[PDB]
Symmetry: C6
Subunit: 201 residues, 6 copies
Amino acid sequence: GDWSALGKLLDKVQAYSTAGGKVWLSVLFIFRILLLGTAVESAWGDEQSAFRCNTQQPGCENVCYDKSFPISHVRFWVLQIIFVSVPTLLYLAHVFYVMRKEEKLNKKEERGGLLRTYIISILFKSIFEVAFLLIQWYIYGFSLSAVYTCKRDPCPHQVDCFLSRPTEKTIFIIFMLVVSLVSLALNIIELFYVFFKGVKD
Amino acid sequence: GDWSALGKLLDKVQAYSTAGGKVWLSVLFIFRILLLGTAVESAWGDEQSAFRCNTQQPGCENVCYDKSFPISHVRFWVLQIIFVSVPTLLYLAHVFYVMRKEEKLNKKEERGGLLRTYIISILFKSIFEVAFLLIQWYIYGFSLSAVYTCKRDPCPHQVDCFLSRPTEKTIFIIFMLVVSLVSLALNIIELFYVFFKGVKD
Amino acid sequence: GDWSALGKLLDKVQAYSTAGGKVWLSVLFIFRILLLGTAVESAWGDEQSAFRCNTQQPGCENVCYDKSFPISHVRFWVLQIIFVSVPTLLYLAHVFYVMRKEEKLNKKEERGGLLRTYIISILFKSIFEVAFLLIQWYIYGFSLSAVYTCKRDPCPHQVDCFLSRPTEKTIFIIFMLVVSLVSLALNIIELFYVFFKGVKD
Amino acid sequence: GDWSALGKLLDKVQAYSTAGGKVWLSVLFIFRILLLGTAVESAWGDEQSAFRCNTQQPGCENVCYDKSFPISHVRFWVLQIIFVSVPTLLYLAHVFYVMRKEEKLNKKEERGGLLRTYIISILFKSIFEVAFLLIQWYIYGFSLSAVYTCKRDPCPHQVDCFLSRPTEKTIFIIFMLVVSLVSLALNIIELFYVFFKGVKD
Amino acid sequence: GDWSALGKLLDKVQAYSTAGGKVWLSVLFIFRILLLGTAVESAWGDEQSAFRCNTQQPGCENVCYDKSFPISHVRFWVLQIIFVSVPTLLYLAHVFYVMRKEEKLNKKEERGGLLRTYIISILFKSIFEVAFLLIQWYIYGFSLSAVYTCKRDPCPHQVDCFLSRPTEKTIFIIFMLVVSLVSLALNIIELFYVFFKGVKD
Amino acid sequence: GDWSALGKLLDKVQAYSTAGGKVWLSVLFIFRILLLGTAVESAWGDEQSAFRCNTQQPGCENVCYDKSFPISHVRFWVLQIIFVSVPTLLYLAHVFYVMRKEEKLNKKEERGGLLRTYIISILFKSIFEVAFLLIQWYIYGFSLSAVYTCKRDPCPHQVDCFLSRPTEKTIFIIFMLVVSLVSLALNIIELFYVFFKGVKD
């Protein structure tokens, strides 16, 4: 029966959000980590053992795989989802340590404090999301070609290198882009609702 | 002893369903995720390491494996079962946050609201199921041939490529098709029963 | 202390069985899933990486491994044990949803109903078991030869192909057959006892 | 606080054993499954990928690995420990279903029954242990030679085949033999104590 | 409801820290072990199977991989995070065994003791962090070159050896360096706050 | 709230130890199993697939890997830590079964007994530790050379064989030696304190 304090914590954390925003954000988060856990990581299993180039020079395959992928997409999405999940955990720990000290002060004695940090966290989530989307557009684009051309030393003039299952990776890149855009739009919607409520006093 | 609130939640979520529909849907769901977890994924383990073609041109195997399978069947079924399980979780979160706020309003004060979302979710499950069945029929069919012919650059004119255990994959494709059809039929049956009860007022 | 309702559920589910049948069926089930989880699946690990044929024609190994094993024994036994465990779970969910609604009706108001479904489930278990035993006898037999002969296109006239550890697979096939026969005999014994009690009125 | 019924169950199951026998049997069981889980199974990982023979005939390696090991030692010990752990679980389930029905009969009404099954189980454990020890002595012996000679078709007259890490497997075989003998001796000691107490009336 | 004693323990352990230091240290710790568990270890999977050298002399690859990496970065960071997490666990166990004995002494009878060990632990964390940073700078630097030159016996005069994905490892090395510096700065901040409070008496 | 009996058990087991010995032994144990679980076992992954010799004779690599490593270091440390953790579990089970029977005898009736077994267990831990250290010194030493010379049949006169990452294994061997010596010193310290208290009567 020790679940009422968790209910008061879930009340105090989601005090300012819309009743529609909470369910969609939670379901989208569970969807994101389940998709990244089950289907996506098994598709990038042999991302280097199947990468073959058309040459005989020893060491050309490693440097051409270097120049093709500066960072894999899976660890990119892991870093992105961790950086997005950090400020909600910071808000959670802050609200928990406020509630304990406040109950202490109230057992002794028988807006602008908590709203501001909520605004800061919901700003930082959108800022991190748009930063990661811009970096992913600048580095890779939103497709993968089946034939890559490599011009790095110590290979000869130009060699051809062939990727590994690029169609499936293009499909999953499009899915992660759609999920990212939906998350950004929902956070912007929550910001707009809170600042629309705030002007009516 | 903190299980009565979960009993009230299980009462309020399944308020409109048939007593026969609930047990068959739950057992079918457990059957589906257990079959997809244990037997199916281990059969698609070496779907690229055993794919051999009859050529010497370097890079023909990767592009012919590309043209053979635009997306693997396992991640297809994972995406399908996640898209089917999403609206039930949305209904669950909606009903939970209704019940908490309603108990708050009732502790303060000592059809068409919840039925409509139920109709929306049970429509969306069938729509997603028939969409995934049509896409799987359009892309792959419902069999796998042991010999595939490939006509993609930079290979020569036509090469032969041989798949990996296609009989077992055909058997499991037929099982997943049967499970999909049974799920669609049961959801249509539940819709028909609810709309048959609704006209008697 | 929230375990008495599970005790009433375990009372109401096993109301008609023999006191000797329940312990042997439960211990046999735990034995079956433990044997299938630990020892059996690790023996079928390299069922294709060690399958070698005596030829040079590219693609003969895949089609001869196809013709040798239409479906692996491990996923066969997984499908068999899932199809056997399904009707007991259906009976469990039915009895649980009967008990909740009956306690509701009793809190409002301060044979042939449940026996028939029990008979149906204990019929369906034996029917599924004898069906799977007949299919396994018709497809594979109950042994594995160390030398297999293959006559499929695009190989030449006849090639020899050598299996991977067939002695150990023969031993485990005999164990699974013995477990299957013991399960069928015990379910027939329970049916005979219940129909022998039923005629005395 | 729902742990007193488990205490009464642990009282009623170990009613007849020595106070020294219980701790040594339980610690030996935990020792056995921990040793078989952590250290032993990782040593038999590459038991076929490292088995090389001195020939060029295709298919000689599979049949010589067949003739060398009819069944691997790891699955042998798994089968042995499962067959040894079965009768204690049968006694547990029997005593539990006796206790529930007896408490029912006692809530209604406000040696030779349980001793015999205990004697049967503690006989069957020793019988299964000595059977498995005799079979392991008859098939393999208690050592592994580094050089094996093979005389099976379709190889030529005699080929040499070299095993994989036989020293470490000899050490672990000696450890499992010592553990087996200690288990048999302790069960014989418990039988002797119970039959020594039984004659004094 | 057995969570109040853990609340008193969490009160007594964090008695002297800043309200801002605790949330940032806990979130940084969870961030560190999650990053080291998910993304980092999968990038160092094939750190030896993809390391190729430009030679024919057998045994040059093993000794050049030896001279390139005296210790892998992953096990280095594991050792570092374990050595950093040790003194907090020592403080935890000390405070727990103080609290139990003190409650015993208080049930019998119906600064400088605990502050000093806190100062010792928060000194030792910073000392271990700066030691590991200095060793990592002295051995490897903070980058990885794609081409390594090897001059060890029994190779000839000088051979070229090519690493495996050095760009991604450079990125993750920079991330771990940034996390290390942030941890050191926060521990120095907590030391400065406690010694700034201590002089005001 | 069912945690007070575990508190009485933790009181009765650690009744004779020093307040400083318990925290250091528990933290050292957690340190040992965490280091052996995470970092050490992944370093010994390819201990045979990367072991190459300078020869053409088939079967020389297996017998030279045999003569190099009679038993791997990982399973050696697993056996050592299990043999060290056994007598504490024996003492735990003995004290638990004493406490239950003593509470039974006390509910009926409304030094030299427990100290001796504690002395026996804390003797046996040190004896097993010094035995394992002497065996590890006698077999392997405390280093690993990068070049090993092999003189076993059926190889020719003398071949050279090259190990796999010996520097990292030397570092981890030194760490395990340091942990072993610290454990032995702490157990000797606890013995000395208890026998120093015992003479004052």
